[PDB]
Amino acid sequence: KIICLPKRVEMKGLKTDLDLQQYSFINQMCYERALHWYAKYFPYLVLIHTLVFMLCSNFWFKFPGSS
Amino acid sequence: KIICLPKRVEMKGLKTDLDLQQYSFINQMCYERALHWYAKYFPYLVLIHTLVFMLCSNFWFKFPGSS
Amino acid sequence: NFSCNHTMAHLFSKLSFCYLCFVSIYGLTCLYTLYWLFYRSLREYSFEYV
Secondary structure, three states, X not given: OOOOOOOOOOOOOOXXXXXXXXXXXXXXXXXXXXXXXXXXXXXXXXXXXXXXXXXXXXHHHHOOOOO | OEEEEEOOOOXXXXXXXXXXXXXXXXXXXHHXXXXXXXXXXXXXXXXXXXXXXXXXXXXXXXXXXXX | OEEEEXXXXXXXXXXXXXHHHHHHHHHHHHXXXXXXXXXXXXXOOOOOOO
């Protein structure tokens, strides 16, 4: 999950007077925009590569003509 | 899930003074309205097409007369 | 007036693209079989080897 806050602005509190809905919207927006595509797809990426390696290992015996 | 906000309006906060119930209502309304029907039905669409392909593949043997 | 967004869209789009590729291969497969169905006239078979 991505947590987002506005960047540019005795130290007191720094309330942003924004509701929860706006926070969730901002999280979704910046998650789609800023986060790297590979950074998000890495689990599926590794899964697909491992599955393809397994398939190309098993097709040696899974092809009936040579099986 | 669809997140919705009003569109037309040093940058300070932009509170919409709307409660959670209104937010959920707006999410449902715009989800029904704006989101494309195919965009929402894509999982069921793919599932139905795959099921029909499987059924028409297996009916070759599932038909007792030729089975 | 409202600006909205739903989470899966971009991911869905990517997914859909890959899905289309699969279907494409599927169609190609049928074509070959169809050609194999409509080039050899499998209604009559003569051994001519045995």
